[PDB]
Amino acid sequence: ATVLLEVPFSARGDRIPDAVAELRTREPIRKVRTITGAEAWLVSSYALCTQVLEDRRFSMKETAAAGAPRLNALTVPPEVVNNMGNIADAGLRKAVMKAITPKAPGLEQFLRDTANSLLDNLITEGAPADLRNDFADPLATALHCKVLGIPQEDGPKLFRSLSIAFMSSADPIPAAKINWDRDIEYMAGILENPNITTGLMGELSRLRKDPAYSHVSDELFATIGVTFFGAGVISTGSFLTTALISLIQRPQLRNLLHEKPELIPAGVEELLRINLSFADGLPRLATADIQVGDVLVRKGELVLVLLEGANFDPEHFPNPGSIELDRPNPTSHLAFGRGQHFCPGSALGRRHAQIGIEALLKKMPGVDLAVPIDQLVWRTRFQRRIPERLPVLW
Ligand code: HEM
Q1: How many CB atoms lie within 10 A of CB 197?
Q2: Ligand 1, from 98, 278, 280, 343: best to mutate by most atoms within 8 Å of Cβ?
Q3: Nearest-angstrom CA–CA distance, 35 and 286
Q4: Is the beta carbon of 348 within 6 A of some atom in ligand 1?
Q5: Which residue of 149, 155, 170, 379 has the fewest C-beta atoms within 10 A of its own C-beta?
Q6: 136 with 357: CB under 8 angstroms?
Q7: Which residues are annotated as a binding site for heme?
Q8: Contact 235, 277 (CB under 8 A)
Q9: Would you indicate the residue range of the signal peptide?
Q10: Which domains does the chain have, with CATH numbers?
């Protein structure tokens, strides 16, 4: 006798398990058990993944309902699971999205200068260099401090909440609440700080005193700062780190992008497609009885949308494990989700990775792992797949 198949399959972000293609071929919607002990439907084909993500009756908000089957424990207050919905209901969606575009004046040059400075420091210290802790994550932290309008010196402390905030735990995490409440108090102080006049927190600080938003709670204003810092920094930092591994493991692509840097955007789109940075399927709770493939999902059941199920589906992306720079459908991957909850920072995330890779290939054209790839230590029970350190030489 065997127990029900458990998720996640592997914390390794450098290879996709063979199980994924087996599930996709044989039962693209399949029952599994999550780390909390709950049962869930794991969806692993492009067609069914997109169906679930495009049907709002599969609700993100309702995953926070008391007594629901859970992928993992909440690390935020339950209302914050509806964060973007709360922002939209507050009339703040356009302002938030405008503040996080990479097209802001001097934002791309700041990104380039910051990446170049980080890399110069690594070259001065000499190999080996840790491309996660001393490049990708500081670059992500600096970018989001600039985008939020908060002092660069405040970034490191805010960043150090994230190894706990984005845990994927069977049980509530006391440290998550300590850090959450402290980070909220910080952002509430930012809103009352007269020096904070640029970026997202500068714009929120002004809207807060605007009569058209007098009804919006101070709770939400602070929450936007904490959540956009946290989600943006952990997602861009983790993607860039694991994208650098994918690139280092493909020296022919690395040499090509070094020689023809105009291909970097198409390369990053492929690196997004094959990226394993999301450690769990995207969770949704059915609010009605809904047919998904051969399964009638019942109201109240948990559904998990496995992004690498969709992104490695050969019926949508032929030769899916291969990086092809001339695909007919290159942005049709689900690395940023799909539908109601499509990532609002997708443009910023792309530019972070493009500029990071562009600077790295210019400064370190011969970059390569300094340890055998199996020696990378993959973080467990976390919402992202990342190596704890990424040691390279050049
Ligand atoms: C390469 C970098 C990034 C990746 C791979 C990524 C991935 C994703 C994915 C897959 C979702 C959908 C989650 C779901 O449907 O359950 C999402 C949503 C979201 N992302 Fe991103 N993201 C990135 C960058 C960012 C940045 C830079 C920000 C903000 C500064 C951000 C903030 C958010 C927010 C607030 C949501 C929730 C949207 C909603 O519920 O409507 N992300 N992201």
Answers
A1: 12
A2: 343
A3: 20
A4: yes
A5: 170
A6: no
A7: 284, 341, 343
A8: yes
A9: none
A10: 1-394 (1.10.630.10)
Q: Entry resolution in angstroms?
A: 1.8
**Residue nearest ligand 1's atom 6 by CA:** 336
Determined by X-ray
101 CA to centre of ligand 1 in angstroms: 13
Cβ–ligand 1 contact at 141 (below 6 Å): no
Exposed/middle/buried for residue 70 (C-beta within 10 Å: 0-12, 13-18, 19+): buried
d(C-alpha 166, C-alpha 158), whole Å: 13
**What is the residue whose two structure tokens read 């005193």?**
209
Q: Is 337 in the pocket of ligand 1 (CB under 6 A)?
A: yes
Contact between 268 and 354 under an 8 Å Cβ cutoff? The reply is yes
C-alpha 349 – ligand 1 centre gap (Å): 9
Question: The tokens of 266 are what?
Answer: 């198409």
Alpha-carbon radius of gyration of the chain: 21
Q: Write the residue with the smallest CA distance to atom 21 of ligand 1.
A: 343
CA quadruple 68, 72, 77, 82: dihedral positive or negative? negative
User: Whole-angstrom Cα distance, residue 9 to residue 12?
Assistant: 9
Cα of 255 vs centre of ligand 1, distance in Å, is 30
Closest CA to 279 of 92, 89, 4, 11: 11
**Hey, whose CA ends up nearest to atom 28 of ligand 1?**
232
Bridge partners (DSSP) listed for residue 304: 42, 283
Positive or negative, the CA dihedral 118, 121, 126, 129 is negative
Tokens representing 198 are 């640029």
The position carrying tokens 């860039």 is 240
Q: Is 231 in the pocket of ligand 1 (CB under 6 A)?
A: yes
